Every structure is written in C-alpha cells, then in structure tokens.
Design a protein around this ligand. Structure first.
Ligand SMILES: CCCCCCCCCCCCO[C@@H]1O[C@H](CO)[C@@H](O[C@H]2O[C@H](CO)[C@@H](O)[C@H](O)[C@H]2O)[C@H](O)[C@H]1O
Ligand SMILES: CCCCCCCCCCCCO[C@@H]1O[C@H](CO)[C@@H](O[C@H]2O[C@H](CO)[C@@H](O)[C@H](O)[C@H]2O)[C@H](O)[C@H]1O
Lengths: 288, 96, 240, 96, 48, 48, 48
C-alpha cells in the first residue's frame, strides 16, 4: 500500500490496522507482519503453512483486501494496493549501471521498466522480477509556497488547476444515430486536453492579475520529470546502477533459466545507449 | 555462498545522504579488498525487512570464484569488518 | 471457414508488426502496405488481410486556453459541453422490466452532424451569459486508425494470410516472411508471431525424440522375442 | 471496458495502457492484444500457455484489473470492467 | 455435489459474479460483492 | 432533530461537519528531497 | 514513453526544511486574506 507523505504512525493506524482486521483468519495462515515506513509505503507479509497453494493464498488475501478497501483513506486506495504471492528462490540478480556518470539511477531504472522488464518476465521459467533503485518517472511540480501565496493562491487552488487542465476527454462523433435519414459518413472527434511535457505543465493558467497578465504554473514552481520515490538508491562498484532481482517459478531449470536471461540481456545489448552496461554480480545456480 | 552481507545503521533521525556516504566508503573498502569482485550497494535498504528506512543501508560484497580467490569468505569477512569498524559515523557490520 | 474454432486460418500465417520507438500510425500503415505487396509478389501466398486502417478520417478539436480565460469560460465547462453533447454522458441506472438499464444523455442526432454544430453548442462564462464555444476551439481534420491495435503492450497491426501447402509450407514461409520483415524494417519496429505461428515459432519440438525412442522400443521388444540383435531389423526395414 | 464517446486513441492511451501495465506479469501469459473501437469499447485478449487453468487465469487477470481500476477515468470505472474466459465450444446458434 | 472441490467451486462462482457485476445496479457494484466458500454448519458455540 | 432545526441546521450539515473534523492527514517531513545541498536530518511530520 | 505516470505537486525541498517553514505556509480565510498557519497550530518536537 502507498500513502504519500504519511507518518508510519497513521499508516499503521488507518491503513495497516483495518487491512489486518480484514486479512486475519485467512485459510492456512501461519502469521502476518506489517512494516510501515516514512516513505509512505506499507508492506504486509502473510506467511502460510507449508504445502499451502500460493495462488489460492493470493486469491484469498486479495478477497480480504477487497473487502477492506472501502474503509481505507481515499488517497491510499486511489493509488491502489497490490496483492501478490512471493517467489522465494532467487536465480540471478542483474544490474544496469553507468560507469562514467551520464545516466543516474532514475534513467536506468525507468529504462529497465521500459525495455528489459517486460521482455524478461515473458521468458520461459521466470516467476517474478523485481526492480531495486530510484523510482518510476513522475512529473514533479515543485511549488514555491511564497510565490504561490504572493498571487493570492492556495495549494488547493493549484491542485484544482492541474486537475481541471490535465484531462483526457471523449469528444464523440459527427453523424451518429439517431437520424431521420441514413448518414453518409462517420467521423470521430478528438479534443485532446492531456499535457505531455514539462513546458505545457508550466503553462497551466492559475489566475488573472491586476496586470491582466496570465499567472502561470512556471511562475510559482519548478517543473521536472523526476522520480516518484526518493527512498532507495542503487550503486554497483560505486557507479550509479539499478538492480534487477530475478526469481524463478518452482519446477524450472535454474541453470537453463540463468543462461536464458543472460543471453536475453546480451540480445538487448544491441539497443543500449552508450555509457550504460550490465553485469550479473551474483549467480546462485553455480552451486547446483 | 559467494557473497557477504554488510550494512550500516546511522543515528536515529539521520538523512539518506549520510547513509549514502557511509555506504560508499564501505563499498570502496570492499573493492580494495582482494577476492571481492563487486560491491552491490543499496543505501536506504533495511536487510531484515527489505523495507526502506532513511537511516539504514545494505551492501553485498560479491566474491570472486574460489579458484581465483586465495582467502576464505570468513577471512574476507574479518578483514572487511576490521576495515569498516574504523567508521565512527555510525554502526557498520559485515556478516556471512 | 477454419477447421477449428479458436486458432485462425488453416495452413498459413498470423503476424503482428509493432512499433517500439514511436514512429506513428502513418509509418505503421506504410509498413503494412509495403509488406502486403511483398507477400503478394511472393508467388505462393496471396494478398494478406488486416483490420488496421490508418486512413480513417477524423476531426481534432484543439482549444485556445488563452482565449478561454480571456472570454471567461472555464476549461472544464468547455470539455463538459463537448463530452455530454457529442460523446454522450452516462447519468445513472433505472429499473424497468425487472432489470436495470443505463440512462444516457447526449445531443440529439441532428445537432452533432457538422463542424458548425460543434461550434454552436454553448457554455456559460464568468459573466453568466451563454456563449458559443466555436470562438475558442479550432476544429481541423486528421487521419488515424480505427480500431487502435496493440500487441504485447506496443502499437501494432495484424497480418493473417492464406497458405500454399503445394508451394511453400508454413514452416519455411515463416522464415521467408522473417527475411521480408528484416527487409522492410525501420529500427525500433519489429514483428512477432501469433496463433499457430507462435507455436511453430517457439515450440520445443519433441517429435525428434518420440520417433527415435519409439523405433528403439520396437526393435528392443522384437529382439527380446527373437533372441537376436540382428533379426528385428529384418522387419523394421520393410516398412518404408 | 467501455468509455462512452471516446475515440480509439484516447481509449488506447488512457484505458488500454494502464490495464496492460497491470496485467503484464501474470503467470503463464503467452501473449495479449488490445482492440480499441470507435464505439467506445476496448477488448483486451490475454492468451495463456496451453494446458493452463482458465479459472485461475481469469481470477488473476480480474484481480489485476480490479487493482488498476482506480487509475482509470471515472465513467469507465462507473460502467465497470468485465473479465471473462472465452470459450471455443460453439454448439448451437439460434436466431429470433 | 458431494465430493466437489470447494476451492474450485469458490473460484468459479467468484469469476462469474465478477463477469455479472456490470449487469447490476451501480449502487450494488460500488459496494462490492463477496464470495466465500462456506458451510452453514455451526460447528460449536462458545458462551461468555 | 428539534434542537438541530432550532439552530437552523440540517442532518446533512452535522454529518458533513463530522466528516470534516475527524480525519487523518498526511504531513510529509522536513529535510526531504529534492535539495541543492545534501541535508543532514530527516524529520517526519505528524498531523492528527 | 508509451506508459502512464503520476504527476505530483509538492513544495520544493528548500521550502520545507525548518519548523518556521511549516509555520510560514499561508492559506485563505473567510474574508479573502492570506494568513499563515502558524497562528492556528502548535508544532512540537516528539519521538517515534
Ligand atoms: C539482491 C536482490 C534480491 C534480494 C532477494 C530478495 C529476498 C528478500 C526477501 C523478499 C522480499 C522482497 O521484497 C521486495 O521489497 C522491495 C522493496 O524494495 C520491493 O521492490 C520495490 O522497489 C522499488 C523501490 O522501492 C519500488 O519502486 C518497486 O515498485 C518495487 O519493486 C519488491 O516489490 C518486494 O518484493
Ligand atoms: C451460419 C452461421 C454460422 C455462424 C458461424 C459462427 C462461427 C464463425 C467463426 C468465425 C471464424 C472462426 O475463426 C476464428 O476467428 C476468431 C475470431 O477472430 C479467432 O479468434 C481470435 O480472436 C478472438 C477475439 O478476441 C480471441 O478470443 C481468440 O483467442 C483468437 O484466436 C480464431 O482464432 C479463429 O479460429
């Protein structure tokens, strides 16, 4: 679960507590724990008796969180809360890293999200891939409170401006039914109102001045596409990196699977930008 | 197991930048160590819960294969541990 | 029709071209056109068929937000008029006949037939008067696809074709069309197989071990019955 | 999924992509496709490896969709996404 | 039927209520529909 | 309801007042990113 | 990049480093005036 900007205390009180009240009693459960950090993230681990079906455990747990979601804070459930069974056996950890310094952990982690994550999770034998490093891209609008208050504006006003002015919308069609006679043409209408870049967001209009000039978001805020989480860094050999943890699904050939993921990484080798390479700092299949 | 697990706890209320500095120092300590091929660093990672706390950090020392090493992983552990016990900024450790 | 329900054509190929770089819908349509031409001029397979058509006309309604604030009309009221009048709005449910049905609000048919109709719907400004929205919108014409197709998370276009089992079997027609895909190819755009093709493209072929072990088992039980490692062959060689 | 009044592009970008993002990672999924029509309708087909249990596939897909629902536009949420297993076993077709 | 796997039955009933949710009133779909395997058997009762 | 009406108040008024005055709130922390100069301390903020 | 991401709104780091920074945030009263929040709140050091 996520609760951006929340104290561990109130995450425990208003997110962990009602959840726990819901999941308690789930079939075959041995015990559960809840960790609520100051990064606004709650992680609840439910451990079941050995021999329990992991998929069945997952469906039961999500049933109980589905019952629970009605009493969670609005902003908690607006981000969604994800229930997923854990693959315990790690088969390989890879790292994307930038030896010189062109790329930071943000760029490499999101490149992992965009180019190697999806084409690794569809390999024959994986059970779960995990990303460790920085966070997903997010359009950060860094407000200056003083400049906002100078124009007689409140944080709520700015947020409602961003919400009103960054929306898709469904413009319908020209020549659709009902009609007194058959139409000749069908034409769909596009009325795009979604912003795509930092400059457009900075161009949001907040108010009109006594000047008559348009007060804009970049007048009171710095706009960037930064990270959605500033809570965890990743470095390989003291260079910026992102760590990919690969976990095989039970019944697989760990040696063959590690060879497969290594060869796949070598295939994505052709499409990396320069100053970004990859390593496998740990291979636990060698033992077998 | 071809790797070592080291970490650091910094004073309560510390920032992630201080943990980053300490973690980078122990990483380079591990690199200057023989037989340690890699210093996989995650400042901000708590090894016990694998949650994110601002005053803790983890670093795995990925060891070279034995046929290229000339020290047992326990001896690398003792050497790296003697090296990072010199850090006064916080409480650092390295274990098997 | 097909021999079975759920796989595709008979012998042949199903293929998807996908764009991983953002080349746009026109580039995808040109790719599918050039491909289909290449498949046609290959002697065996005929012209392939697709549902992708990037040349569907449509109208783009851009908004002047500066002129919007100048005229005192809210951006959400403009988008709301567009939405409810032209695209219909879901209001709520009602019960009738013992069932539950949708209530839909939309402009009647003959008030959303022309661009003047788009210009003519009216929303309210901060002065409280009713103002047409055509002054603040710029309706232009553009060409795009309908339906929009995605395959494996990227924009894509389908391509299923007839076969020629008397000319080019699907197994090597597959690598043929792979050579064509490398031929007519922008970087950042590729092909991926689907339906039976995916199977043939990714199968861990096991027949090449079932056939040996089968003949081995036959020869072995024959040897058992014949007390000879040489007599069973006198039967296994008579089948070809 | 239904986005009444939406054109194929807005449906693809604001309904199909988040749903595909939430579905990707479901086990035994061999491929998937999304079709967005001018009628305001999105049909996303996830095909799994042969021998997969269609009921487990359906419940897992529906669970991921349900968790993605909150990031979907309000009227799409209000209309409701539906997950269902597709059957090839046509036995009879009857017309009135 | 006796001898049926209650877990498989639960999952199938759950899938079908999920598919039927869009044909129900919005006020119902909003509140969510629960599907639990259950025997109406009160196995025992503890009194305080 | 007689007293609530005697104060010119409605059931909706009192209900919304209760909604608006018993609520959890998130309040972030001091010394958090992004900073041009690295911070020493990270101090969580609790508003109740 | 073909995916979807959140857009977030927060004070830039250098404006949320101190207690006085919290006390200095301003908002609107019932007569349209911009008032800082420090006058209506108490801010206390604690541990957790
Ligand atoms: C060296 C890597 C492999 C280590 C082996 C893992 C075994 C440890 C016990 C299993 C617990 C793993 O628990 C793992 O917690 C991490 C916390 O970063 C989550 O990982 C997360 O990292 C980043 C940054 O925080 C998030 O933006 C992202 O969404 C998520 O992937 C994983 O989703 C969860 O599975
Ligand atoms: C006189 C009345 C006759 C009524 C006949 C009704 C049967 C008609 C069937 C149409 C053709 C059958 O051919 C079949 O087409 C369907 C629909 O595209 C394809 O189906 C494909 O798309 C559908 C649509 O999402 C997916 O669910 C499916 O997994 C995929 O394979 C099959 O792969 C192909 O085998």
């Amino acid at each position: 679960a996520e609760y951006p900007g929340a104290n561990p205390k109130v995450i425990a009180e208003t997110v962990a507590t009602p959840l726990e009240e819901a999941i308690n009693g789930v079939e075959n459960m041995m015990y559960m724990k809840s960790v609520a950090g100051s990064d606004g993230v709650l992680v609840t681990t439910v451990t079941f008796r050995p021999g329990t079906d992991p998929d069945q455990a997952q469906v039961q747990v999500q049933n109980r969180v589905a019952q629970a979601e009605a009493r969670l804070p609005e902003d908690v459930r607006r981000l969604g809360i994800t229930t997923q069974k854990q693959s315990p056996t790690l088969t390989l950890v890879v790292h994307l890293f930038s030896p010189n310094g062109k790329y930071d952990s943000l760029y490499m982690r999101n490149y992992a999200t965009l180019k190697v994550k999806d084409e690794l999770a569809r390999l024959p034998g994986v059970g779960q891939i995990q990303i460790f490093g920085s966070g997903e891209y997010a359009m950060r609008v860094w407000l200056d409170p003083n400049k906002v208050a100078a124009r007689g504006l409140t944080a709520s006003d700015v947020v409602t401006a961003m919400q009103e002015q960054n929306v898709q919308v469904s413009a319908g069609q020209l020549g659709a039914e009902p009609l007194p006679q058959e139409s000749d043409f069908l034409i769909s209408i596009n009325a795009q109102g979604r912003l795509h870049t930092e400059e457009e967001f900075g161009n949001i209009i907040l108010k009109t001045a006594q000047d008559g000039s348009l007060v804009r978001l970049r007048d009171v805020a710095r706009i960037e596409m930064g990270s959605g989480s500033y809570a965890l860094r990743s470095q390989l050999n003291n260079k910026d990196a992102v760590g990919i943890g690969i976990f095989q699904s039970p019944g697989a050939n760990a040696i063959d699977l590690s060879n497969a993921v290594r060869a796949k990484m070598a295939e994505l080798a052709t499409r990396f930008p320069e100053d970004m390479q990859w390593a496998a700092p740990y291979d636990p299949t060698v033992f077998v | 197991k071809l790797y070592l697990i080291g970490g650091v706890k910094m004073p309560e209320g510390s920032s992630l930048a201080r943990t980053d500095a300490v973690i980078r120092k122990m990483s380079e300590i591990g690199m200057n160590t023989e037989g340690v091929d890699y210093a996989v660093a995650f400042p901000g990672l708590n090894a016990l819960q694998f949650t994110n706390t601002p005053n803790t950090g983890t670093v795995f020392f990925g060891l070279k294969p034995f046929d290229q090493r000339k020290h047992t992983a326990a001896e690398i552990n003792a050497e790296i541990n003697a090296k990072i016990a010199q850090i006064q900024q916080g409480f650092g450790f390295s274990i098997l | 029709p097909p021999p079975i329900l759920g796989l595709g054509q008979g012998s042949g190929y199903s293929l998807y071209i996908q764009d991983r770089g953002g080349l746009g819908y026109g580039a995808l349509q040109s790719a599918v056109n050039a491909m289909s031409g290449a498949i046609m001029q290959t002697p065996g397979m005929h012209f392939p068929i697709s549902t992708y058509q990037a040349n569907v006309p449509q109208l783009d309604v851009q908004v002047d937000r500066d002129k919007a604030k100048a005229q005192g009309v809210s951006l959400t009221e403009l988008f709301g008029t567009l939405q409810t009048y032209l695209g219909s709005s879901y209001v709520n449910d009602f019960n009738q006949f013992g069932r539950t049905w949708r209530v839909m609000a939309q402009a009647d048919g003959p008030y959303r037939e022309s661009v003047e109709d788009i210009a003519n719907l009216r929303t309210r400004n901060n002065q409280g008067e009713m103002v047409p929205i055509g002054s603040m919108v710029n309706i232009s014409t553009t060409y795009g696809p309908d339906p929009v197709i995605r395959y494996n998370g990227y924009p894509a276009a389908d391509l299923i074709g007839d076969a020629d089992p008397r000319v080019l079997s699907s197994s090597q027609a597959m690598t043929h069309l792979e050579e064509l895909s490398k031929q007519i190819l922008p970087n950042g755009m590729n092909i991926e197989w689907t339906d039976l093709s995916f199977q043939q493209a990714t199968q861990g072929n096991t027949a090449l071990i079932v056939f040996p072990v089968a003949v081995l088992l036959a020869f072995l039980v024959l040897a058992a019955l014949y007390e000879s490692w040489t007599l069973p062959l006198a039967v296994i060689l008579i089948v070809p």
